[PDB]
Amino acid sequence: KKSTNLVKNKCVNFNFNGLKGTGVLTESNKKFLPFQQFGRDIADTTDA
Amino acid sequence: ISVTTEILPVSMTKTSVDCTMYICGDSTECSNLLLQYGSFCTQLKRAL
């Protein structure tokens, strides 16, 4: 694969480690743990 | 001389739904596949 700079606050396509999606990315105030990679909402769709 | 209270509902909240966002979401291939089923969306929209 290749790599590309990170853009924020614009609706874009993203491919994070095989996770494909379309949306806008924003800085987060959430706190994770060293054994976690991403979070989920009620409908088991990624949010962070 | 007595005063009594009665309560009666009148109205109800109004909702609207989107087909493609709920069923497919952010994937175009699902939309192109769903275009070949029917016109259930028209019926749902008319009822709502």
Task: Give the SSE layout.
This is part of a larger assembly, with 2 copies of chain A (48 residues).
Chain A: E1 12-16, E2 19-23
Antiparallel strand pairs in A: 1-2
Molecular structure report:
- By secondary structure, chain A is mostly beta strands.
- Chain A contains no helices and two strands.
- In chain A, strands 1-2 form a two-stranded antiparallel ribbon.
- The two termini of chain A are 23 Å apart.
- The chains hardly touch.
- Chain A: It comes from Severe acute respiratory syndrome coronavirus 2 (2019-nCoV).
- Chain A: This is Spike protein S1.
Can you tag this structure with a few keywords?
Spike protein S1 (chain A), viral protein, SARS-CoV-2, Delta, two-stranded antiparallel sheet, part of a larger assembly, 2 strands, 2 chains, 48 residues, mainly beta
TL;DR of this structure?
This is part of a larger assembly, with two copies of chain A (48 residues). With 48 residues, chain A is mainly β.
